[PDB]
């Protein structure tokens, strides 16, 4: 039996179910479900053998010699769970079921298991975060950067946070015309300030230029108030995230990007990095060829031809630029993609964690996801798809596993950098999928208001900081040349081994 | 001007010579010769531009025409130079020239410069090792494992060294006939015995089986007095370094293996070694993707068509079966190949490194080498081919460098288990070409005898030890689970870049 939670029971448990391990081999045993997990138990073996999976990682449950009578798990951590019953068991009916039920309640009108679990914790993680002390600790307002409380209640952009912070000349009757010429309303707004420089990291969507080649006053004076700002005005950069030719299709389509024409005193540079399907096809070709077990004779080749570290390269080398353009160059910048909410959080809080030694801190990082992932709208329910049985919906991708990947990469360029360790990230990526925790439910701050989040779940960062000794990095603190470098290079980054290929008792 | 070597002196100097860098461009100054090395010095940089490289690493000197006119030189360290002089300067006759004679000097009737060497040293590395004393270490002679001088005028087998252990009870008459049997009379005789166990880990060539199934009483009866000769006399096992098609390809041109007719307590295992023609394509596929540019996008799928990896995997993979065998299973093991001095070297002396702790010493190790691969007979002079203007000879293959890389592996997945680090391993390397030192010149003990190398050169392991704080690592001490178990996977291996791609000033 499983070790129950506060707000978890037992909804099924059945004995004599085989799991078929795919390194060890047949084992036999008890599997129980409750409203939060799967587990399985055996007592035949030493130490025994435990299976102890959230529901909230089950992608699919399918219906199955020796040994094929069964329920199959595909999960979103990189394995397959699959088990025996018997044909004269008759468990299978109810187990399927079950799981079926519990482990998809978006799909069936239930409660996502954070609305029951009643643990309570010494910190309130959801007070950690506070828009208006994170720019204070940046310096901001200033003279050249001020606070508008125009989307206090969502009206200019319903997927940003209430608090933007905009460029001080500019007023908020010209912030409502650009947020007509941005797709969804999504312009451009300080991520981060250098405090030697004043120059800026700045994020948004998309112009909506369009076949006609469409122009905005107001969003071209917008930038140029963006440079404005910064001390030495040499020139804006704007950090498109996509390959030209993909910014090109979305220009036909209404969207596009900042023409040399209109954008007078701008450099356009295309970052290469592709779109969510695409990231998504990669992950499923990185699972097929590392799991249940790896063919070591073209292993180097099969991982090329997912391209998962060409991805992973691509997304560092763009970070890498608008860091180095910000810090070498004492130049402003302006990141962009084509909704602003995937490929741009990537990249700013990448860039900001090469900038600022603050989100290397446990709590520091904490913040960095809640500001630039949480608070800016990168769409989670989608993306992840919590308790919901459309394992092929189009919408779906690893877009923040991607970036914790890349995070991963830095803590291995620079083990001294980081508070944080790697099992501090693998837990992160444990709770994306575990719905236990409220913090990556919704899509929007706008969403996760309604749904009243802070008084109706726990923050997975409550718990992370009930528990500082097993994330805590002990070579950390002695790395006061305070800006990370990290090369972005097929020889020097490495396939996560830790996270992707972990199953393997070995 | 080059800081000259005792010994060494300037052949010929060229004033305003361009070396073409093709990482950090065109650069101009001074190209000296000497009877050792190649100099480019440049006072147009800083810090200075130096080019350091010894004649013995040029495999080809090419003209460019007759900046487009002027010198290539190939060369063996996974590297290409060229220069560019003037047609108005004709300098390039004279240069050419000069390199052509002093880089072969073997082929021009000339001194390798080893023999005009004349520093000193604080030791003397060819004292260091004695085959008696390494002998004794081991706990030989004793009752089983007998000192014969048979050998000690080259009569028995003029390819192994002048002292044998072989069993106690086999005498002299009869090892005349068992040398009859093994190819070149590279009978099996004693590499290494664990103290413990009386176990050995004992060498040879193939046995001359041919296409006849011929066979010998006193070599069958040889091999169970090796049996015997073990406490534990379970059963004894005899490693064949090929794969079987290649062994059975031998038998029908004289050569074979042991038949389990003829062998009757012996299992032969074949570990799938493949042959010195296989490496050298295989050392030039990776020299081609490594050097000058590497292309990023291909670089995984390119690098296993190499197959460089997958050869240094196997290689160890055998070494690992060989140790496990020793150490755990308590039995005697034979090991061959076809001629016993290539593949088996790479077997024998990467066994013992993982059985005994004393050849991970830096004192160990040149004991290792003395011992296992030259006076063993590895032919080094036909591998490398030293001074010797016949680049395309089907007689080179970087067996040693195979031997080398397979122990960075080791001290990259063990780095407290060696007294050696990195720089040791690629100063042994430049050493191997440089010619500088007697260590590697030769194809025998003989050979090294009739050319009196020890009176006529120094040894590197003399320059080494006046040197070893440059060598030693730091980690080193700390690993007293005295047997090493690396993996041999595709995973856990990587491509020494310290080694192959070092050109780079990144």
Same mark, same amino acid.
């Given at each position: 039996?499983?070790p129950?939670?506060?707000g978890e029971?037992?909804?099924?448990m059945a004995?004599?179910?085989?799991?078929?391990?795919?390194?060890t081999?047949?084992?036999?045993?008890?599997?129980?479900?409750?409203?939060y997990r799967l587990?399985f138990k055996?007592?035949?073996r030493?130490?025994?053998?435990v299976l102890?999976?959230?529901?909230?990682?089950?992608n699919r449950?399918?219906?199955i010699?020796?040994?094929?009578?069964?329920?199959e798990?595909?999960c979103?951590?990189i394995?397959?769970?699959?088990?025996?019953?018997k044909?004269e068991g008759?468990?299978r009916?109810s187990?399927?079921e079950?799981l079926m039920?519990?482990?998809?309640?978006?799909?069936?009108?239930?409660p996502?298991?954070a609305?029951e679990y009643?643990?309570?914790?010494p910190?309130?993680?959801?007070?950690?975060?506070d828009?208006?002390?994170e720019?204070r600790?940046?310096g901001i307002?200033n003279?050249?950067?001020?606070i508008?409380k125009?989307?206090?209640?969502?009206?200019?952009?319903?997927?940003?946070? @209430?608090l933007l912070?905009?460029?001080?000349?500019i007023?908020?009757?010209?912030?409502?015309?650009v947020?007509?010429?941005?797709?969804?309303?999504?312009?451009?707004?300080?991520?981060?300030?250098?405090?030697?420089? !004043?120059?800026?990291?700045?994020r948004?969507?998309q112009p909506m230029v369009?076949?006609?080649?469409?122009?905005?006053?107001?969003d071209?004076?917008?930038?140029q108030? %963006?440079?404005?700002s910064?001390? !030495?005005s040499?020139? %804006?950069?704007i950090?498109?995230?996509?390959?030209?030719?993909?910014?090109?299709?979305?220009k036909?389509?209404?969207?596009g990007?900042?023409?040399?024409?209109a954008?007078?005193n701008?450099?356009?540079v295309?970052?290469?990095?592709?779109?969510?399907?695409?990231?998504?096809?990669?992950?499923?070709?990185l699972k097929?060829?590392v799991?249940?077990?790896?063919?070591?004779?073209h292993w180097?080749?099969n991982?090329?031809?997912t391209?998962?570290?060409?991805?992973?390269?691509?997304?560092?080398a763009?970070?890498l630029?608008?860091?180095?353009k910000?810090?070498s160059?004492?130049?402003?910048?302006?990141?962009h993609?084509?909704?602003?909410?995937?490929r741009?959080?990537?990249?700013?809080?990448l @860039?900001?964690?090469?900038?600022?030694?603050?989100?290397?801190?446990?709590?520091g990082?904490?913040?960095?996801?809640?500001?630039?992932?949480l608070?800016?709208?990168?769409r989670? !329910?989608?993306?992840?798809?919590?308790?919901?049985?459309?394992? @092929?919906d189009?919408?779906?991708?690893?877009?923040?596993?991607?970036?914790?990947d890349?995070?991963w990469?830095?803590?291995?360029?620079?083990?001294?950098?980081?508070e944080?360790?790697?099992?501090?990230?693998?837990?992160?990526l444990?709770?994306l999928?575990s719905?236990?925790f409220?913090?990556?439910l919704?899509?929007s701050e706008?969403?996760?208001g309604?749904?009243?989040l802070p008084?109706r779940?726990?923050?997975?960062?409550?718990?992370?900081?009930?528990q500082?000794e097993?994330?805590?990095?002990?070579?950390?603190?002695?790395?006061?040349?305070?800006?990370?470098?990290?090369?972005?290079s097929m020889?020097h980054?490495?396939l996560?081994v830790?996270?992707?290929?972990?199953?393997?008792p070995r």
């Amino acid at each position: 039996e499983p070790p129950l939670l506060p707000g978890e029971n037992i909804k099924d448990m059945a004995k004599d179910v085989t799991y078929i391990c795919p390194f060890t081999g047949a084992v036999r045993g008890t599997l129980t479900v409750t409203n939060y997990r799967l587990y399985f138990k055996s007592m035949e073996r030493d130490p025994p053998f435990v299976l102890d999976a959230s529901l909230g990682v089950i992608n699919r449950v399918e219906k199955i010699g020796e040994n094929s009578y069964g329920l199959e798990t595909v999960c979103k951590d990189i394995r397959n769970l699959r088990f025996a019953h018997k044909p004269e068991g008759r468990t299978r009916r109810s187990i399927f079921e079950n799981l079926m039920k519990y482990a998809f309640p978006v799909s069936n009108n239930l409660p996502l298991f954070a609305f029951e679990y009643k643990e309570v914790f010494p910190e309130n993680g959801w007070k950690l975060y506070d828009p208006l002390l994170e720019y204070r600790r940046q310096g901001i307002p200033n003279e050249s950067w001020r606070i508008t409380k125009i989307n206090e209640r969502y009206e200019l952009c319903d997927t940003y946070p @209430a608090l933007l912070v905009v460029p001080a000349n500019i007023p908020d009757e010209e912030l409502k015309r650009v947020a007509s010429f941005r797709s969804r309303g999504r312009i451009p707004v300080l991520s981060w300030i250098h405090p030697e420089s !004043q120059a800026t990291i700045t994020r948004c969507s998309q112009p909506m230029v369009g076949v006609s080649g469409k122009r905005s006053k107001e969003d071209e004076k917008y930038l140029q108030a %963006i440079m404005d700002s910064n001390a !030495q005005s040499h020139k %804006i950069f704007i950090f498109d995230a996509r390959p030209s030719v993909n910014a090109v299709a979305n220009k036909a389509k209404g969207g596009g990007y900042e023409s040399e024409d209109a954008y007078q005193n701008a450099e356009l540079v295309f970052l290469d990095i592709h779109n969510i399907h695409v990231m998504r096809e990669s992950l499923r070709k990185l699972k097929e060829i590392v799991y249940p077990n790896i063919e070591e004779t073209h292993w180097l080749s099969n991982l090329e031809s997912t391209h998962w570290l060409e991805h992973i390269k691509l997304i560092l080398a763009g970070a890498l630029r608008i860091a180095d353009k910000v810090e070498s160059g004492k130049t402003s910048v302006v990141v962009h993609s084509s909704d602003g909410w995937d490929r741009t959080a990537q990249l700013t809080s990448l @860039a900001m964690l090469m900038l600022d030694g603050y989100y290397r801190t446990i709590r520091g990082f904490e913040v960095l996801v809640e500001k630039e992932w949480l608070s800016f709208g990168h769409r989670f !329910q989608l993306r992840v798809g919590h308790g919901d049985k459309n394992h @092929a919906d189009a919408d779906r991708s690893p877009v923040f596993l991607q970036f914790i990947d890349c995070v991963w990469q830095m803590t291995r360029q620079f083990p001294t950098a980081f508070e944080f360790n790697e099992y501090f990230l693998i837990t992160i990526l444990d709770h994306l999928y575990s719905c236990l925790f409220g913090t990556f439910l919704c899509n929007s701050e706008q969403q996760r208001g309604k749904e009243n989040l802070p008084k109706r779940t726990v923050s997975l960062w409550s718990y992370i900081n009930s528990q500082l000794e097993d994330f805590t990095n002990p070579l950390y603190g002695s790395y006061s040349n305070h800006v990370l470098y990290p090369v972005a290079s097929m020889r020097h980054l490495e396939l996560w081994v830790g996270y992707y290929i972990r199953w393997n008792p070995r």
